[PDB]
Design a protein around this ligand. Structure first.
Ligand SMILES: CCCCCCCCCCCCCCCCCC(=O)OC[C@H](COP(=O)([O-])OCC(O)COP(=O)([O-])OC[C@@H](COC(=O)CCCCCCCCCCCCCCCCC)OC(=O)CCCCCCCCCCCCCCCCC)OC(=O)CCCCCCCCCCCCCCCCC
Ligand SMILES: COC1=C(OC)C(=O)C(C/C=C(\C)CC/C=C(\C)CC/C=C(\C)CC/C=C(/C)CC/C=C(\C)CC/C=C(\C)CC/C=C(\C)CC/C=C(/C)CCC=C(C)C)=C(C)C1=O
Ligand SMILES: CCCCCCCCCCCCCCCCCC(=O)OC[C@H](COP(=O)([O-])OCC[N+](C)(C)C)OC(=O)CCCCCCCCCCCCCCCCC
Ligand SMILES: CCCCCCCCCCCCCCCCCC(=O)OC[C@H](COP(=O)(O)OCCN)OC(=O)CCCCCCCCCCCCCCCCC
Ligand SMILES: NC(=O)C1=CN([C@@H]2O[C@H](COP(=O)(O)OP(=O)(O)OC[C@H]3O[C@@H](n4cnc5c(N)ncnc54)[C@H](OP(=O)(O)O)[C@@H]3O)[C@@H](O)[C@H]2O)C=CC1
Ligand SMILES: CCCCCCCCCCC[C@H](O)CC(=O)SCCNC(=O)CCNC(=O)[C@H](O)C(C)(C)COP(=O)(O)O
Ligand SMILES: COC1=C(OC)C(=O)C(CC=C(C)C)=C(C)C1=O
Ligand code: SF4
Ligand code: SF4
Lengths: 178, 385, 339, 75, 198, 92, 95, 157, 114
């Protein structure tokens, strides 16, 4: 099904009345005045902006935001170094090397997410079997120096501890969907 | 001829464009656009990345129509795997595909005006655009660059409040198109700036491979959404807005109509979305559900292999074209039996359009060229790839 | 130590952790450049606000350049800077005695405390930089004071290399820009009409490369190298040559120094970085000393670079649109004076 | 013509590699004084300037001795 | 499992025979994928002739060039596989004509047949190095002005050999041999077990 | 004088700004169309002049001659314009 | 909203439209957050019977392309049936 | 209070406030991060409110926001535009493509960070760094500009 | 053997083209050093041209030579039609990079893999 836009169905022959109406349109800028009315109208509408520090634009539970590594309620970090979070990262951001901890458990000696390399796809959130690496809600982590953006296990684990309460609520809300 | 380059920093240059102009006085006699300022190596990087981990790349080729772009890769990979997405997923891709064409057109119509000098239309619609991204963020978690449309099906089910919120946006959006409609469609100043500028004849448009609103604006009747119905575009009713003459106005008017026609398609999708699963049930192609991988061994093995290695699509090659908001976006994916692709030629509606700038901007002023780029809706991510 | 691995460019390792206290300087900028290029660990003590040291960040790689807040009067700041460095390079210097820092401080007092701590720290080597032809009796307080320092620091730090550069030729240098900027002055005073003060400039990079090479070479210990240059010059040709490339009229008019030292005193009174200095003036007409000494460039591995070669880049900003396109070939060279 | 020849010789004398001593109107640098193929082309270029006359490669290749140059320059 | 209509695999198949018959001097192989896509394969010399017949034949009008690309099979003697995908708005069908070109054996240019190819042919030269005779203005489009090497060739390193940084000493951007701070981890992904006879 | 006083303050205010502004911080583009416009501009600018005395000339006792003159001037220039339009001039 | 009637009337008029009916700012009409928990449906293939994969794996039952005219009277045939002309819309043919 | 130190602390506080309140940014407009700021310029998160200019030519720009990948063909330009900006000038690197190479790090045509080309003051993280996130980054630049004490350093220099 | 000719039937004809390009570059070096305000000497640059034109002196095959000038011509076009700014040109001179010694003892002293 098609539709002609800007196709004049027929040649309306000028009638004085028509001509006057048109000539008035050119002479007294009638349509231009129409446009001014629209903007005056909004001037009276409530502005949609938010006080950025005081009010925040709404983000729902799946917002990917900033990486964090979670821990079991007991206190044992969730990651067991299966290293498929490294395998599926599209940007090669996550670097993981592991060795059996003294307890005998499997754990990662080094877990480094290069956030400048990361493109926040959220697949790592997807891939983890124990769901140790999660996309945390915080988006405000702008840093003065490039090195700060590179994150080792201690920053991510600390990021995990700080935001665990909200991360748990967010995962709680969206897990049925996944 | 006073060679002058439209350097990248200039706002009208979309950030990266070095149009070497030869100014025969203010009249410009030749343009030699020097693209390449945003070539990222998108198609040599994909060869080194598995099919799922290359999806994200497709959200960054045209960065203003993310999901429609990732519906072309998803359809391609799906063809090469002879798998089809479940019924609910196909409606969701059509629902998100039209939200993206409204999103691209708000981008194209308002930024064109920003270039010409009308500043208010951009602000009114951009507030309507963040309303829309929210829909991306609420369904995928990313305002833009979602990664929601997956090679098989889509990634996660719609949250339980999205379709009501999409109705409320679509219910009131048309007045918003109506409002810039009044402010920038009859202004003698717009018409003069846009009418009879960059006229492209019908056969020339086909020969230059324009394939988009540029094809439809000159009267050729081609929409890959009705001609070759991908996904469910066979079960939704819409009217292609064919323009008559080809001036940059007829092309604007067509873009404003497609936003209106997309609201007609979005309405149908909310009214008729089926109950069902959002991703095909073959664990070999789409990853197993979180509960299943944590309770059934066959699912953990399938999750481990899919995330670590890949789908391993059967050897073959396909060119799949979908009507992206800019025009025909196609992926020629050549596939060896391996889990990672061998070649992925992204046909960008835009490589062809920018080539046409020299022919279309003929006998035109420095100012007309700003309108000519604006009416091609060119995003240099797609052209540079 | 740090075994040197890599191919040689950025993102590679050379194993030189080096505090460099006066890096923000014209010479400094260059010292950090090579050290960063080579891949060395560079600690840059700074006092000026962060805004001004940004130019040093892109040099060197991530985690290769570390900036520390430091105050000369506060001994503790120098202490922590050299805590983990194994090479200390001292480029602290100024031409205008500032209200709160005297030539002694900038040249002898401070550069002592620094090397003193460096030893306490156990830094393998310290490189101290003092101006060329610096007699303990030289006229300019600056030069003499600098001489005083090179002695002292030897007692605080024995076998501490002491490179002694001539006035330096480089973009952002004074030697070349100062004269070129005499344009504002309708007439360009030149003591003895710019004669009998033969001068041998040295490209900044040559100096920098030399300095860097010192850091990575065992041959230099207690050595007092003298980076000099590839050709000497009577101040006359230099001045005119400059004006030549700048394409601005040259009007050499002699000015009795006794009166000129007074002109230096005048600008010297300026609160904001006096442009000329009584101590400068003398220095400018202080003849370059002859080259019989531990050789510097070439000896340390870099072949000096003639002034005319890069002069075009240093003096270009001073030309007018009319001459901007003009090139070195069009212009004439100055003449040397083995004297 | 002698003056023209002097011009030809003049140019050669200027070229660095050419040795003033070996230089003679009958010297063929391509084969004698040791000038490289590319150098011969460069020489012709200098001649094109001194004589303000353009030489096609077809003919320029044919010119490998200064006399020959003089002869062509002649016509 | 995707729905497949054999109507197309029959229509397209027949057309393939039709093209082949009409252009037997160049058509070497004409196949229809299981995905209902035709792919006439032509000798490189048939570039001009086969395209023109498709652009201007009443029973096969293929007016627009969707894409011109060159896969690179290093094993294949003729390294590149120029592939031209065309669309027929009249018959709503697409066909692909693919030829083979080695590095120093150029292909003809079709800018005459379709001017769309003016840019894509420059793109193929820049990335793969195939040369197109009779091209109006062949010159690098996507790569940097001084780039050395053709990037999409399978034999070109991803990271490449040169990277750019600003050097103060010279106050200008300067290439240096690439030195990467975390090399691309080359995960081996192929499994030692096949999937089906194919 | 009163004007002189005002104007020098006016220059002083501007020179003060620029001075602080610089002190506190411490080839062939030609189209006959453009030349043609400038010309037309003066032909019109001169006419503006011959038309400027009209406020004083209104009070002239003649009146008939005044208008007869003024109408002729405006009409003949406008015809000049007319021919400018007719010719490629004014068509940039 | 929350606009004195007069401002609204001026607004509606100057714009020429009942902008109040369709305000852009959202107020208590947007889906409340914490919508109820979702129990999503399990699709086909979850049957515990007659679910053999061999009978549901289009991935590799696909075969190598069919080959015609390999190098190693008759009526004319088109790529496909000539296309059918699109028909003008009926809700809004023009405009 | 009475002390040449107090007068020099208060007056920079004045100079810093002026630069902080009116930052006129100049966006190159590379890739897609430019869109995620066109959203900051837009009505939900106005930037002008904070004293930010939607469009500013290089010579009149205080802040350069590099949004998007800096390819090896745009690098030579960025440096030019950074070099031609007025002296008081600051750079905000937006996007994992610009602060670091992000997806496309290992490409042969992408500079691995704009920090290699232009000194960077605040690094805003995120593939499309959210628009509040840029607004937080611009506000962090304002916190950095408040802390600067140029007049104090000249007095005790 | 049995190859098809790209543009030059034999090394002889091909060499003709190289001569032309050399001339082109030779005549252009001076202009670039002035339109780009490069800090190099025309003589110096002209030697560089020679360097490159000989770096590939060994090629014996006619087809390879022909492409080489096509490519060479393209570079000239980018430098005379100026689309290549100084950074691009100076790169030819490898001015910033530190030269690597080729002496075995030198390499031994510095790199694991020479
Ligand atoms: C000037 C005369 C008064 C103008 C006036 O009252 O306008 C608002 C008043 C109501 O307008 P509105 O758009 O319905 O206001 C939004 C809410 O209804 C009413 O807004 P609200 O619900 O936020 O009500 C509270 C508001 C109530 O504030 C007001 O309505 C009075 C504002 C007076 C501004 C003067 O007070 C505030 O929020 C703080 C701001 C108070 C005024 C700030 C600016 C003062 C400028 C003083 C120097 C000029 O305007 C009219 O009654 C009709 C004016 C027709 C003009 C043609
Ligand atoms: C691209 O260049 C630019 C422009 O030109 C188009 C702009 O207009 C703009 C936009 C600027 C604005 C509208 C705001 C600027 C406003 C001002 C400078 C006015 C501030 C007021 C004063 C100068 C003080 C008044 C007078 C005094 C000096 C003292 C009073 C007695 C920008 C940002 C820009 O960069
Ligand atoms: C209180 C604030 C009032 C604002 C009024 C303008 C904005 C609202 C416009 C609403 C609208 O859409 O209607 C426009 C309407 C819309 O009409 P239209 O363009 O849709 O078509 C109607 C006209 N015909 C049918 C003939 C083509 O425009 C008009 O009615 C004509 C306006 C003519 C204006 C002529 C120039 C301005 C007046 C110049 C003379 C001086 C007047 C006084 C100046 C000030 C003195 C103090
Ligand atoms: C006896 C007399 C009988 C009636 C005579 C009427 C005379 C009208 C006086 C102005 C005439 C202007 C005109 O004729 O139109 C020119 C132009 C529109 O003409 P256009 O459509 O380009 O026609 C092409 C033909 N070459 O007009 C324009 O381009 C207008 C562009 C306007 C851009 C700003 C518009 C602002 C409009 C609102 C403010 C209007 C002024 C109100 C305040 C006035 C002072 C109080
Ligand atoms: N022509 C030349 O440049 C020559 C120089 N030299 C020697 O080389 C050295 C470097 O010269 P150059 O770079 O030109 O000198 P600069 O004037 O550039 O200053 C060098 C550095 O010293 C620091 N500095 C100066 N005074 C103090 C102080 N009181 N406390 C702490 N730091 C201070 C400066 O830091 P900040 O700016 O932050 O205060 C600056 O970064 C000098 O010491 C000089 O004696 C010798 C011969 C010729
Ligand atoms: C200052 C800016 C520097 C830029 C320099 C210039 O642009 C770059 C460049 O030389 S562009 C590549 C030139 N390269 C050719 O043109 C191929 C040469 N081909 C041969 O050399 C053959 O081997 C041959 C048989 C001819 C040997 O014969 P001969 O030794 O030349 O005589
Ligand atoms: C909508 O098309 C585009 C623009 O023009 C309106 C651009 O301005 C820009 C960049 C503009 C700036 C300076 C933010 C981009 C990236 C773009 O895609
Ligand atoms: S996947 Fe989850 S668990 Fe396995 S390694 Fe990555 S993070 Fe640790
Ligand atoms: S960072 Fe993510 S978003 Fe910003 S440009 Fe690179 S890819 Fe596009």
């Amino acid at each position: 099904t098609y539709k002609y836009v800007n196709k004049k169905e027929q040649e309306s022959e000028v009638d004085m009345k028509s001509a006057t109406d048109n000539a008035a349109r050119i002479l007294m800028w009638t349509e231009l005045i129409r446009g001014l009315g629209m903007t005056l109208s909004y001037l009276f509408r409530e502005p949609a902006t938010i006080n950025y520090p005081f009010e925040k634009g709404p983000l729902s539970p799946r917002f990917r935001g900033e990486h964090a590594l979670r821990r079991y309620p007991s206190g044992e970090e969730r990651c067991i170094a299966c290293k498929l979070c490294e395998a599926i990262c599209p940007a090669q951001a996550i670097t993981i090397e592991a060795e059996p901890r003294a307890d005998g458990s499997r754990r990662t000696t080094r877990y480094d997410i290069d956030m400048t390399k990361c493109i926040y796809c959220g697949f790592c959130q997807e891939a983890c079997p124990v769901d140790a690496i999660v996309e945390g809600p915080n988006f405000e982590f702008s840093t003065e120096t490039h090195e700060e953006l590179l994150y080792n296990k201690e920053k991510l684990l600390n990021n995990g501890d700080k935001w665990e309460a909200e991360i748990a609520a967010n995962i709680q809300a969206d897990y049925l969907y996944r | 001829n006073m060679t002058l380059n439209f350097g990248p920093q200039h706002p009208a240059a979309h950030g990266v464009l070095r149009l070497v102009l030869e100014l025969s006085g203010e009249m410009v006699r030749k343009c030699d656009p020097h693209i390449g300022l945003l070539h990222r190596g998108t198609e040599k990087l994909i060869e080194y990345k598995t099919y799922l981990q290359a999806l994200p790349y497709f959200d960054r080729l045209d960065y203003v129509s993310m999901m429609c772009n990732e519906q072309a890769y998803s359809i391609a990979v799906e063809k090469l795997l002879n798998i089809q997405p479940p019924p609910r997923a196909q409606w969701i891709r059509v629902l998100f595909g039209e939200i993206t064409r409204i999103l691209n057109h708000i981008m194209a119509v308002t930024t064109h005006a920003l270039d010409i000098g009308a500043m208010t239309p951009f602000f009114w619609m951009f507030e309507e655009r963040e309303k829309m991204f929210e829909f991306y963020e609420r369904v995928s978690g990313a305002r833009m660059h979602a990664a929601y449309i997956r090679p098989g099906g889509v990634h996660q089910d719609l949250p339980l409040g999205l379709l009501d919120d999409i109705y409320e946006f679509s219910k009131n959006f048309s007045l918003r198109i109506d409002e810039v409609e009044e402010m920038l469609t009859n202004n003698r100043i717009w018409r003069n700036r846009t009418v009879d500028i960059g006229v492209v004849t019908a056969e020339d448009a086909l020969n230059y491979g324009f394939s988009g609103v540029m094809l439809r604006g000159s009267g050729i009747q081609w929409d890959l959404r009705k001609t070759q119905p991908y996904d469910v575009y066979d079960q939704v009713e819409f009217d292609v807005p064919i323009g008559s003459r080809g001036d940059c106005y007829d092309r604007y008017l067509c873009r404003v109509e497609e936003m209106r026609q997309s609201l007609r398609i979005i309405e149908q999708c909310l009214n008729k979305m089926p109950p069902g699963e959002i991703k095909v049930d073959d664990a070999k192609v789409s990853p197993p559900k979180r509960a299943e991988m944590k309770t059934s061994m066959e699912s953990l093995i399938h999750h481990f292999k899919l995330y670590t290695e890949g789908y391993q699509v059967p050897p073959g090659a396909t060119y799949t074209a979908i009507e992206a908001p800019k025009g025909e976006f196609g992926v020629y994916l050549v596939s060896d039996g391996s889990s990672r692709p061998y070649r992925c030629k992204i046909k960008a509606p835009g490589f062809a359009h920018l080539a046409g700038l020299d022919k279309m901007s003929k006998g035109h002023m420095l100012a007309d060229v700003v309108a000519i780029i604006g009416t091609q809706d060119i995003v240099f991510g797609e052209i540079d790839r | 130590a740090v075994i040197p691995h890599g191919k040689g460019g950025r993102s590679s390792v050379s194993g030189v952790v080096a505090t460099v206290f006066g890096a923000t300087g014209f010479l400094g900028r260059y010292v950090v450049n090579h050290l960063g290029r080579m891949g060395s660990q560079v600690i840059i003590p700074y006092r000026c606000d962060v805004y001004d040291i940004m130019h040093l960040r892109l040099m060197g790689d991530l985690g290769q350049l570390t900036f520390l807040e430091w105050d000369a009067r506060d001994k503790d700041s120098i202490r922590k800077a050299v805590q983990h460095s194994n090479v200390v390079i001292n480029l602290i210097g100024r031409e205008w005695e500032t209200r709160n820092f005297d030539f002694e401080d900038v040249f002898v007092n401070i550069p002592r405390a620094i090397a003193q701590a460096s030893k306490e720290a156990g830094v393998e080597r310290f490189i101290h930089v003092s101006h060329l032809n610096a007699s303990m009796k030289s006229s300019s307080k600056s030069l003499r004071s600098k001489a005083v320092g090179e002695k002292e620091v030897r007692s605080v730090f024995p076998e501490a290399i002491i490179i002694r550069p001539s006035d330096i030729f480089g973009r952002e240098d004074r030697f070349l820009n100062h004269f070129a900027n005499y344009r504002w002055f309708l007439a360009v005073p030149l003591v003895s009409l710019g004669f009998k003060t033969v001068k041998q400039p040295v490209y900044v990079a040559d100096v920098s490369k030399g300095i860097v090479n010192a850091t990575k070479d065992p041959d230099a210990v207690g050595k007092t190298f003298a980076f000099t240059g590839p050709n000497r010059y009577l101040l006359f040709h230099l001045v005119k040559y400059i004006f030549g490339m700048t394409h601005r009229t040259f009007i050499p008019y002699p000015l009795p120094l006794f009166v000129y030292s007074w002109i230096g005193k005048l600008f010297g009174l300026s609160p904001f970085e006096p442009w000329t200095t009584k101590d400068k003036v003398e220095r400018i007409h202080i003849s370059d000393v002859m080259p019989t000494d531990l050789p510097g460039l070439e000896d340390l591995g870099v072949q000096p670079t003639p002034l005319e070669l890069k002069s075009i880049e240093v003096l270009r900003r001073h030309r007018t649109y009319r001459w901007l396109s003009s090139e070195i070939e069009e212009t004439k060279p100055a003449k040397t004076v083995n004297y | 013509l002698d003056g023209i020849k002097d011009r030809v010789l003049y140019v050669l004398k200027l070229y660095d590699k050419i040795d003033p001593e070996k230089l003679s109107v009958n010297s063929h640098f391509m084969k004698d004084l040791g000038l490289d193929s590319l150098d011969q082309v460069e020489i012709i270029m200098a001649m094109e300037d001194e004589f303000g006359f353009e030489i096609p490669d077809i003919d320029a290749e044919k010119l490998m001795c200064p006399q020959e140059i003089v002869d062509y320059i002649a016509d | 499992v995707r729905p497949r209509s054999d109507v197309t695999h029959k229509q397209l198949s027949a057309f393939g025979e039709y093209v082949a018959e009409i252009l037997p001097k160049y058509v070497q192989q004409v196949q229809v994928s299981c995905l209902d896509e035709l792919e006439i394969c032509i000798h490189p010399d048939g570039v001009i002739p086969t395209l023109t017949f498709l652009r201007d034949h009443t029973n096969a009008q293929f007016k627009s060039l969707a894409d011109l690309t060159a896969v690179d099979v290093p094993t294949r003697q003729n390294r590149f596989e120029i592939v031209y995908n065309l669309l027929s708005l009249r018959f709503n069908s697409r066909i692909r004509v693919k030829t083979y070109a080695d590095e120093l054996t150029p292909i003809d240019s079709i800018v005459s047949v379709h001017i769309a190819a003016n840019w894509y042919e420059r793109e193929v030269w820049d990335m793969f190095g195939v040369f197109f005779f009779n091209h109006p203005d062949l010159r690098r489009i996507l790569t940097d002005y001084g780039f050395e090497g053709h990037p999409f060739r399978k034999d070109f390193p991803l990271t490449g050999y040169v990277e750019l940084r600003y050097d103060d000493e010279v106050k200008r951007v300067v290439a240096e041999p690439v030195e990467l701070a975390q090399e691309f981890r080359k995960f081996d992904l192929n499994s030692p077990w096949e999937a089906f006879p194919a | 004088m009163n004007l002189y006083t005002v104007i020098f303050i006016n220059i002083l205010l501007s020179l003060t700004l620029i001075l602080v502004a610089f002190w506190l911080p411490q080839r062939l583009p030609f189209s006959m169309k453009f030349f043609l416009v400038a010309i037309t501009f003066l032909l019109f600018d001169l006419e503006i002049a011959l038309l400027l005395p009209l406020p004083w000339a209104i009070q002239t006792i003649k009146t008939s001659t005044m208008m007869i003159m003024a109408f002729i001037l405006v009409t003949i220039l406008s015809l000049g314009l007319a021919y400018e339009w007719t010719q490629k001039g004014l068509e940039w | 909203a929350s606009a004195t009637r007069v401002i609204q009337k001026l607004r509606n008029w100057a714009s020429g439209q009942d902008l109040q009916a369709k305000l852009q700012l959202r107020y208590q009409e947007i889906a409340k957050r914490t919508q109820p928990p979702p129990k999503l449906p399990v699709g086909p293939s979850h049957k515990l019977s007659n679910n053999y994969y061999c009978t549901r794996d289009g991935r590799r039952e696909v075969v190598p392309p069919s080959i015609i005219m390999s190098s190693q009277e008759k009526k004319a045939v088109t790529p496909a049936p000539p296309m059918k002309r699109w028909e003008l819309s009926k809700d809004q043919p023009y405009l | 209070r009475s002390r040449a130190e107090y007068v020099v602390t208060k007056l920079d506080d004045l100079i810093n406030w002026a630069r902080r309140s009116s930052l006129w940014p100049m966006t190159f407009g590379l890739a897609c991060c430019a869109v995620e700021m066109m959203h900051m310029a837009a009505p939900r998160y106005d930037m002008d409110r904070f004293g930010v200019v939607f469009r500013a030519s290089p010579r009149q720009a205080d802040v350069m926001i590099v949004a998007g990948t800096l390819t090896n063909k745009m690098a030579p330009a960025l440096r030019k535009v950074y070099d031609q900006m007025p002296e008081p000038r600051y750079v905000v690197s937006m996007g994992s493509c610009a602060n670091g190479g992000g997806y496309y790090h290992y490409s042969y045509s992408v500079v691995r960070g704009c920090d290699r080309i232009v000194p960077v003051d605040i690094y805003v993280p995120g593939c499309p760094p959210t628009a509040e996130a840029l607004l937080y980054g611009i506000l962090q630049l304002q916190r950095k500009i408040k802390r600067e004490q140029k007049l104090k350093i000249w007095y005790r220099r | 053997t049995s190859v098809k000719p790209i543009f030059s039937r034999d090394l002889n004809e091909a060499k003709r083209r190289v001569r032309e390009l050399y001339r082109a570059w030779y005549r252009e070096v001076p202009n670039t050093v002035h339109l780009m305000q490069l800090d190099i000497t025309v003589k110096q640059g002209r030697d560089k041209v020679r360097e490159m034109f000989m770096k590939n002196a060994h090629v014996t095959d006619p087809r390879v030579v022909d492409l080489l000038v096509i490519k060479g011509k393209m570079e000239l076009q980018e430098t005379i039609k100026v689309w290549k700014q100084r950074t691009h040109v100076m790169r030819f001179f490898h001015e910033t990079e530190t030269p690597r010694p080729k002496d075995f003892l030198s390499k031994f002293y510095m790199g694991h893999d020479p």
